């Protein structure tokens, strides 16, 4: 469920990583010669080196759903809020009153419709 396993940490793996602002950013895993440390190219693009353990705890797979079919109300997601920002905001899909958009209530208190292409899945207990 988008939770990362050690075996999958390979060069080019697409991930989302939290920064010190409680928001998520899309990144890519770059393996290094030493085992169990990785550089994450974080979207300009800058890098930060992570241990294996910190990646397992903090990062999630970057997974874009194809449609709203399996994003019913209650589904945990994050989302691009604007084209002008590369941060993703965590929240949950909520029931409105559409195969290509969902209504999301964000942890920060905002609510808005999000195009499915701007949704990324999250682990339920993230």
């Amino acid at each position: 469920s988008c939770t990362i396993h050690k075996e999958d940490l390979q060069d080019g793996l697409p991930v989302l990583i939290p920064k010190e602002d409680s928001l998520l950013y899309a990144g890519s895993v770059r393996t290094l010669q030493p085992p169990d440390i990785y550089s994450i190219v974080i979207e300009g693009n800058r890098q930060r080196i992570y241990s294996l353990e910190q990646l397992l705890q903090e990062a999630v797979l970057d997974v874009q759903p194809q449609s709203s079919r399996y994003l019913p109300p209650g589904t945990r997601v994050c989302a691009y809020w604007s084209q002008k920002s590369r941060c993703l905001y965590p929240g949950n899909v909520v029931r409105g009153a559409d195969l290509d958009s969902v209504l999301v209530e964000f942890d920060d208190g905002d609510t808005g419709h999000i195009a499915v292409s701007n949704i990324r899945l999250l682990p339920p207990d993230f």
């Binding site: 928001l23 809020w81 604007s82 002008k84 920002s85 941060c87 905001y89 920060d108 905002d110 808005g112």
Partner: peptide, 6 residues
């Protein structure tokens, strides 16, 4: 971190 307004 300011956020775009809707």
């Amino acid at each position: 971190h300011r956020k775009v307004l809707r």
